[PDB]
Every structure is written in C-alpha cells, then in structure tokens.
C-alpha cells in the first residue's frame, strides 16, 4: 500500500504542493516539503503577476465618430480596431496555452527534483521501487525519516546494516 508520484497525486497532502509519505515502526503519515512549496509558490505568483501587471496601457478612448460624409474614415477606424482585436485575441490564447503547458512541466520538474535528492541520499541503502517510493534496506526510525526530508541523512551511518539486508535479497 501507498505509492508515489509515478502513479498520481495525493489527496492526503494538504499542507503543501510537494511532500513525502513514510512508513516505519513508529507509524506513517504525510509531510509537505515546505521549502520546495515556498519556492514554487513565489514562482507561480510572480508569473501570474507578470502576465497581469505588464499590461501597461495608454488611455483608452471611445471618440471614434466621424461625420456623415466620412463613412470611409469610419470604416478605417472600424478595421483598425478589428486588427488589434485579432492581434490581442490570438496572442492571449497562445500565451495561456503555452504558459499552462510550462506551468505543469514546472510542477513535474519540482516533484522530480525532490525524488532525485532523496535518491542520491539513500544511494544503495534503499531500493528504488519505480513508483516514486524507496525500500529502505535498514530500520529508519522517525529521526532517520526527518534527516532524509531535511537532506541530512548519512549514507555511511546505515551502510553496514543495509549491506547485510541486501545480500539476503541476493
């Protein structure tokens, strides 16, 4: 039971965008990577604000009336606004389409970056299950789990214990 990011998201992760789930002797639970959530929240907020705040426009006017014998000038004004309508509409559509695809890729990179940090810490003291989870080859008590999530897990501390558990699997 309980799988990782390869098979989808977690409804139980409520205190952050990215996080971890653990299981050992002392229990189980979800825990968000607060710092990674912080860094991504700033990036998404900045992107939305940049798309919004950069629209610094000249004063808009509705004075577009010409006299009765100047219908050709009125048509020129009509097609000028048609041209800008086409320009803004097309650019706005593809802006949202492009950014939405990149935003989803941005979340995927952040999730993958947490997965790589844990993978390089555990090295061969754990087995990558291929579903976003790791099979710790040693007892990992609650202090050990916190060290992994804080980036302070020691490879050589559990190295001997993991080696004996690995040769049993072989």
């Amino acid at each position, epitope marked *: 039971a309980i799988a990782g990011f390869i098979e989808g998201g977690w409804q139980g992760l409520i205190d952050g965008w990215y996080g971890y789930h653990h299981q050992n002797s002392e229990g189980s639970g979800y825990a*968000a990577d607060k710092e990674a959530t912080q860094k991504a929240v700033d990036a998404i907020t900045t992107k939305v604000n940049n798309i919004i705040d950069k629209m610094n426009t000249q004063f808009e006017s509705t004075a577009k009336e010409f006299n009765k014998i100047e219908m050709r000038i009125k048509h020129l004004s009509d097609r000028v606004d048609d041209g800008f309508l086409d320009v803004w509409s097309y650019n706005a559509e593809l802006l949202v389409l492009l950014e939405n695809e990149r935003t989803l890729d941005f979340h995927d990179a952040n999730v993958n970056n947490l997965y790589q940090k844990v993978k390089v810490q555990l090295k061969d003291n754990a087995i990558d299950m291929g579903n976003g989870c790791f099979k710790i080859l040693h007892k990992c008590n609650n202090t050990c789990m916190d060290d992994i999530k804080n980036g302070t897990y020691n490879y050589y501390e559990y190295r001997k214990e993991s080696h004996l558990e690995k040769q049993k699997i072989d």
Partner: antibody
Framework: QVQLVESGGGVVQPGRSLRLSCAAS????????MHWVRQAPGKGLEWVAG????????YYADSVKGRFTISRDSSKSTLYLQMNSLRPEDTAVYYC??????????????????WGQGTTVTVS | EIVLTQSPSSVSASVGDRVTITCRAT??????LAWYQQKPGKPPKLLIF???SLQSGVPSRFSGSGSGTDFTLTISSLQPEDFATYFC?????????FGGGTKVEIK
C-alpha cells in the same frame, strides 16, 4: 462565524504550570496548522510554538523550549499550550493564530489571518 | 533566527498624511512578509500578506511593497481609525519573527 477563543490564563506563581485552550469554530480546524503568539505588556509580538495540522510536527521558540508543549484535539477542535516551569518573563497575553492558506494548500508558514481576543498569563 | 528591524519606532502625523514604515530583514525572505494593525487591548489584524497582497476587507489605501530584504508599508491617506501600532512579520522559516513595532500617533 470564523473565530478562535482562548482560555486558561490567570495569575500563577513562578515555577508552576498552566494549560491554555484555544476553541476553534467556523472553519476546518483539522486542516490548518496552528500557532501560539504572546505579547508582553508594552512589548512586541513573540511567536512561541506551532503545530502541524495532524499534530505530527511541532516547532518551538528557544525561549520556551523544554518547558512548553503544544498539542491539539481533533474531535474537540481545540488547541492547547501546556506551560511548565513558568517564569516572570513568561508573563504576556497569549494568542492562538491561524496561518493563512494560499493556492488552496494550508501552509503553516504564512501570515496569520485569524486571532482570538487572547488570554492573560501573569507570573509573579 | 531572522531578525526584522522596523523603522521608525514611532511617528506622528495628521489625518490625510502619507505614512511610510519600513521593515528590514537580516536575510532574504523573498515575499513572505506580513503587516499587522493592532489597537490597544485588541488582537493584531492581518493587513498585508505576500509583502504586497491586500487582505480581504482592508481599504485600498493600505499598500505594501518589497522583496528579499527591504519592505515598505504605505498608508496613502490617513484616517481617524488608522492610529494604531503596526508590526511586520516574516513567514520564510521557523522561528516566526516580528518587527519591533511602529506606533502611528496624532501630533
């Protein structure tokens, strides 16, 4: 409709113990982390403790470490602060504060959008 | 511990004035700053989060700006009900820390 209610403060001799209670209503109390913030008379705001939504993770300021214990009751929607070995410098008005959610995630590190009226603890 | 230095410790102004309060951090806190308004005997009220975002139900005369280390809270046109003490709070990392405070008082 959404507001907290602190209780349990009072006059207490040095070295004794108190337990504060923060009764929450109007919001999903079990989704938010919670914090305790105290204010000495005439002084500024000092954060003392915080706890995650499920109670698994707890954070303490150095000034109350080893003496204060935060905790929560999911079924009662109540937050607690057990205060041991009380000192005159612990005298303050104690608030329970809710960190703000953003983008739909209840991040514990944020601004504090909800506070109660506070309860007064006087150590002398 | 990230320490927030608030300036000025106090200031006197009249109604309709423009009031600037600054908050300085020892290290980069990106956008995780908050501004609070506190009347005597009452709990603090959240005014600004994200160092610039206006909290729902707060007049538009309150504005915040800044990123990383230096932040500013501005009251464009003071009102009678704006005379209080104001605090800046960081939300970058534990422990949560507050500024020394700024009392806005009548002259």
């Amino acid at each position: 409709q959404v507001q907290l209610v602190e209780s349990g403060g009072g006059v207490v001799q040095p070295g004794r113990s108190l337990r504060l209670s923060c009764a929450a209503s109007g919001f999903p109390f079990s989704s938010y982390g919670m914090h305790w913030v105290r204010q000495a008379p005439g002084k500024g705001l000092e954060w003392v403790a915080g706890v995650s939504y499920d109670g698994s993770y707890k954070y303490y300021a150095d000034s109350v470490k080893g003496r204060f214990t935060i905790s929560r009751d999911s079924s009662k929607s109540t937050l607690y602060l057990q205060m041991n070995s009380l000192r005159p410098e612990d005298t303050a008005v104690y608030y329970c504060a809710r960190p703000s959610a953003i983008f739909g995630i209840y991040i514990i590190l944020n601004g504090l959008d909800v506070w109660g009226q506070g309860t007064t603890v006087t150590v002398s | 511990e990230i320490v927030l230095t608030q300036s000025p410790s106090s200031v006197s102004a009249s109604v309709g004035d423009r009031v600037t309060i600054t908050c300085r951090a020892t290290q980069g806190i990106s956008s995780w700053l908050a501004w609070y308004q506190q009347k005597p005997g009452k709990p603090p009220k959240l005014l600004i989060f994200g160092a610039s975002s206006l909290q729902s139900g707060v007049p538009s005369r309150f504005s915040g700006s800044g990123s990383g280390t230096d932040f500013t809270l501005t009251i464009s046109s003071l009102q009678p009900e704006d005379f209080a003490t104001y605090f800046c709070q960081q939300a970058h990392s534990f422990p949560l820390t507050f500024g020394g405070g700024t009392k806005v008082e009548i002259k």
